[PDB]
Amino acid sequence: MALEIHMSDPMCLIENFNEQLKVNQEALEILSAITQPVVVVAIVGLYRTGKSYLMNKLAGKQSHTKGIWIWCVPHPNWPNHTLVLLDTEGADNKNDIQIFALALLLSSTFVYNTVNKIDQGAIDLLHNVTELTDLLASFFPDLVWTLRDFQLVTPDEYLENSLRPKQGSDQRVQNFNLPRLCIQKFFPKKKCFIFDLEPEFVQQVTEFCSYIFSHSMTKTLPGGIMVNGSRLKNLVLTYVNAISSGDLPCIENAVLALAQRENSAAVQKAIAHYDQQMGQKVQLPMETLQELLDLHATSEREAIEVFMKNSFKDVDQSFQKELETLLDAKQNDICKRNLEASSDYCSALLKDIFGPLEEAVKQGIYSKGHNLFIQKTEELKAKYYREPRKGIQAEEVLQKYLKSKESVSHAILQTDQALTET
């Protein structure tokens, strides 16, 4: 089951309106339904607003300030891959650093979109967002630093030269090297672009898109764990609830929370499959108990397989043992329902087979006599035993009914013997 989604316009994902970080639930239902692997490239534009121009070129064809906006499009070069675009723009206060580090945590490519040239303020700002996403192999996202509006030096050498530290040890050169060295090791792969309709300006914006479409990889987690639309939803809920609660987002707790949710979903898909198979193949008045248990075993082994194909790092087999106890409870319930259905069905058979019989004795039709009453009851037991499928509780309910009619049979014998003497 694969559901490919293509949306025409971007939506709001995280809201920083007022003071609390609110999550747009409608954007999560669209994201969760995505089954393909996602390539999340986050676009963060500082200072001047860029009318989300880079986001539209990456999508294949309004203000995104205090919050993150998401846009899911199919990858143009990678088949069966979903391109997820995150756009956000913003001395800037501390509330925008939280959403920038969020976009950095959710992304596999971080597009830093500033203006003019690389100043100390933009480096200090990028250094600040890397601290909220704690860093304590290749799951770190790559940096794409774009510069708008402007000894031959290439843009790549400029970015590598804008981060080259100067030797020294005073508390004003160390503070000059600390942010420029903290992002040197944070982003292992770096790329720089210089921007300036003009026929030459689109040349740099297309090779920027060609670099994003050819280099940006599927987002992964520590442990070689590919991320799709469902797992990115849990990453957002884990990271947002971490920031909104005052905690620093730890990544080892995000993967455990994701594992505990995919396992809870696994035991539900197993029970759902078991309920479907059991509800479609079982009519309660079964012929024999063994035929009901064989139906349960076939549905049980299929449910266990559905769990194993959807589980993810089952800790101590706690979810598998939980599933096996629920299946055993359904085995005891269906066997109890099988006996009740056999008793209730067989009770309705006696009301119709012995209905006219106990109604005939009420009018004294055997008050002759009794030898014709025992042979008529015996005749009705042959019709009851030759019913097509009545369950396994057929013998116990018949005897329980016959022992309740002993007083009626003894009374007919008294009347039959009372008139033979006269």
From Swiss-Prot:
Residues 35-217 form the GB1/RHD3-type G domain. Residues 1-247 are annotated as: NLRP3-binding. Disulfide bonds: none annotated. GTP binds at G45, L46, Y47, R48, T49, G50, K51, S52, R148, D149. It is an enzyme of class 3 (hydrolase). GO terms for cellular component: cytoplasm; cytoplasmic vesicle; cytoplasmic vesicle membrane; Golgi apparatus; Golgi membrane; membrane; perinuclear region of cytoplasm; side of membrane. It is a lipid-anchor; GPI-like-anchor. Expressed in peripheral blood monocytes (at protein level). Induction: By IFNG in endothelial cells and in LPS-primed macrophages. It is found in: Cytoplasmic vesicle membrane; Golgi apparatus membrane; Cytoplasm. Isoprenylation is required for proper subcellular location. It catalyses: GTP + H2O = GDP + phosphate + H(+). Belongs to the TRAFAC class dynamin-like GTPase superfamily. GB1/RHD3 GTPase family. GB1 subfamily. This is Guanylate-binding protein 5. The lineage of its organism: Eukaryota, Metazoa, Chordata, Craniata, Vertebrata. The chain holds residues 1 to 483 of 586 of the full protein.
